[model samples]
Target: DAVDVPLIKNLYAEAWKQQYSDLRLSTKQTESCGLAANTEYIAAPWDVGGGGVLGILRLADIGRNPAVAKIKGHTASIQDTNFSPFYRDILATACEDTIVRIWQLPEEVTGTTELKEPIATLTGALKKVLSAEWNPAVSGILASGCFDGTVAFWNVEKNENFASVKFQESLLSAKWSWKGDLLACTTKDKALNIVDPRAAQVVGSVACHDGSKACKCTWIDGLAGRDGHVFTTGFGKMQEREMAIWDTRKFDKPVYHAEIDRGSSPLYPIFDETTGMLYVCGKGDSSCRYYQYHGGTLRSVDAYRSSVPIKNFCFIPKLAVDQMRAEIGRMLKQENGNVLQPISFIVPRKNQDVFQADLYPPAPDVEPSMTAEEWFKGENKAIRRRSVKP
Candidate 1:
């Protein structure tokens, strides 16, 4: 049953939509969102016949036919791509060619040309790489999950794999904890694992879902004044879609579990720790459900429904949000497979001209707090934050 709590009206209203010119995304149905964004630019991947390519567009040029920069390096399709949180111009790509390459975009693009040279290249996976995520707390550190049942941590600056952990089954998702000391992962074996990447050990493991389909997990930050809780989205025994919250300390059962609906596509969860809001959107689904996580429970906010089915969705960094409009968060929604539209979640307020301090808290800044060397030495540090108000 759905929660009986009153929906928070006017919480996440549509600010605007942008038109992307002639975009051709990947044809793979099981692929995660091959879209990423930083403060200045947005990177969306395209499916070239047998090679991987990405179209880079500026955020300010959203409504018009913006100048697009193409990046090519992999022989196969790009499965996942992410922009570094510390550096706005640096990007990392995980390809089906068993390679992860790092690229740097220029401060300005004069004309459209293929960027074939990468700053660094990471190789060692026995199978194709499926996911790549930059560590939020540490600088120049990244984690990639491969189809060969391995999760490897990379030092992008040095271009080396420092540590790795292997599983029995292929990994579906790998996410870093808020503190950046631990990693939460989901595998094809239908299990959720808590790993210490630097130590290269699996500290905790538990069966997450029943269905053999794809599942994804993300750590819930600052939940009930603690940090061991995790949120997951996947399928159930009857192939019904579901979502749950778990405690890593005790893997006995989920703190909260609910079945969403009977659907074939998997659900993707994006949690905003600053506001304690969780946005859950499914692939091939037309609606996005959002909730406020407070007092150890998820209160229903409302759903942002659209006529076009979503191919992929991702949230922009908090620092990139426009506080002048009382916009708490913004997400880039790739709909109808090729159209990249931006959906802003705004907080209703009559005084939009003034800086709302309550709505705009100190958000994570672009600079990182710790170096990769310090993190590898068994140190845990949180990312630095700055005021988002202008």
Candidate 2:
């Protein structure tokens, strides 16, 4: 997986700072904020949330938080992932292993200290956890939906939890409405249910997608601006699709629907109320693009590539103590402008020479004949033949 991390996420932030001012400014700002956040994004953690909790933390969480003491044993990927919408540090990880992990991250005030330790873990569901979310309005209040067709809410601070439901299908994603009063759910069976966590009841239900094909949906912030607008994504047919926007006050049908170019999965369609812009990662696209929704229309604004593909990106634009930034710059110069990951190898087994060991791309009308090894040998022989005569 480390091999798969993009050149940018793994790129030396400091070296790039010289080439990109936004990255530089972002780095400076984050360093100024100190180690309260984090320098590296921990991909996975083994396990370490405390208490008699049984269903949240996973190896992925342990791997991310160096502060965590890995549980001696465990297995599998995190089934669902969610971070606190408020504080950037606290994270909630759920897995089929039957435990939900809720941990806190250190504040930048610590300068370079490691992030804070995870304070609690939750365990109550009788089934593998399918999805989890922290109350957008309150810290430590976590809601987890499981394959058991049940939803449960936990008051993490008080260690109090209650089953919210035994629904009709497997719930994949659940979102707290704009005000955090109502909850909306998308199921593998292609159903949508809006429930009030407090009432422990479904207020409205709709059979959203046909169960025949693999389908996905998302509940986006509706009243994104002062007017409040909500949207959802689903395929009309084929993988190509349309997005449905609705007024929460009325869900009978989308107030508007837009047919977008094919391939964008229905994920998070973030609406920045402040900017009145909608940001999304369209399916099979190389960039994260933005659009402006105004006067009842969604208009494409712009798209920017991340130098590499990224599942999702936040505009945090901050880096840790300038030390790493400066370090990257110094190394780029030392390593001759080729800034890359600091991999340790005993033997220099790869280089321009290694790369040359391939058949050159054939000319438009030509045909290739040599094997890979044979091709490299032929090129090497040609170079030898051109050596200084004598």
Candidate 3:
């Protein structure tokens, strides 16, 4: 008599490395990538060769990969796309056709298909629209940056354009503060303009970088504390990468500046409000450098290096993290047109106890907004750098 033994099937089969080649390759940095708020989906817009296709992918089912459903309607290339912060299925896209379109996604999709219609389409830009960002705190409110140096604020629910302001030149990046009170963008003339959405005016303007390359900026503790600071990254003399910090109240000059590294590609900043940490990564870099923001200054922490260079990166929202596990934070890295890698930042913890750098409260569900008069009046307090669990 003989007995049979169970066998494991290809234990090292490498299933997670599944790739899709249909995505448009961006030769340079642009605000064309989007990950859904629920972390269940992702959207990538087309480049010049993409033929007006915006591809949506479901992360979990990429084992074999499905025919990515492309949401296509624009006659020109898409410059940017964004997912609504409140609704997981809602999406927004900016195109070179001078249209900003919003789409409502269904719960599921299978096989190849085309989402040809948009729920709302915003028009009236003199040039190609470059980027669109949803207000992190409010639903159905959005903003757009165009090539003709205009920033338009929209009330998507009514399909009405609320306010529009003209600038001196085109914008490379447009972002909302965590509190949703102020909007900021980097202009092509190497300057950063802060806008007050309700008043529809450029409240503050400052020369950020000293080069032709795009200058990127992010708000750190802007909404949380009374007196917030802005962080910027760009090229300095000799094309050296630089990072600078500025006081929001006084933008005449940066309070602190330092060289980041030597790279020509634009550096993007991602701030973790929970930890008061700032991470900077660029188009061709194999590593993401980290820093801690304390008392209006950026202090270097350490760098996480990888063998493969990354093109884009985004952080997972704090709500999705598993609190019981040793893991702390996570992010997704896009290395090329096909492969997307997820990297986790872990903090080893015990069953009922934990030992980490610091523990801070998660961001508020709905952060309150401040007016220009209230913000510039300067009743703001300093941010507590970090916290620890007892």
Going through the candidates in the order shown, the clash numbers are 0, 29, 2
What local lDDT score does residue 229 receive in model 2, on the 0 to 100 scale?
Answer: 40
**The CA-based lDDT of model 2 is what?**
0.43
The whole-model lDDT of each prediction reads: 0.80, 0.43, 0.67
lDDT of 1 by residue, 307-326 (tens): 88888767888888888887
Local error of candidate 3 at residue 209 (angstroms): 1.8
Report the number of the highest-lDDT candidate.
1
Runs in model 1 lying further than 4 Å from the true structure? 1-10, 15-17, 222-225
Q: What would you estimate as the lDDT of candidate 3?
A: 0.67
What is the Cα-based lDDT of residue 213 in candidate 2?
31
Candidate 1's displacement at residue 315, Å, is: 1.3
Q: What tens digits encode model 2's per-residue C-alpha lDDT throughout 1-390?
A: 111101111221221332110110001110000111123332222223332221221111222212222221223345555655544556676666767777664443221334323467687778778667765444455778787778788776666774376677777667655444567776666666677666667777665543233233334442323233455555665655556666656767667776655654453455543223555543224445556554556666554443433322232211211221211111101111111111110111234233321111111111112222342242211101011111
List runs of model 2 lying over 4 Å from the truth: 1-75, 86-89, 106-118, 209-223, 226-229, 264-266, 282-285, 305-308, 311-390
What C-alpha lDDT, on a 0 to 100 scale, does residue 326 get in candidate 3?
A: 32
Per-residue accuracy of model 3 over 200-290 as CA lDDT, tens digit each: 8888999888877778888875422224467788888577899887777888998888998888778888776655567787767887777
Model 2 TM-score?
A: 0.57
Better of 1 and 2 by TM-score: 1
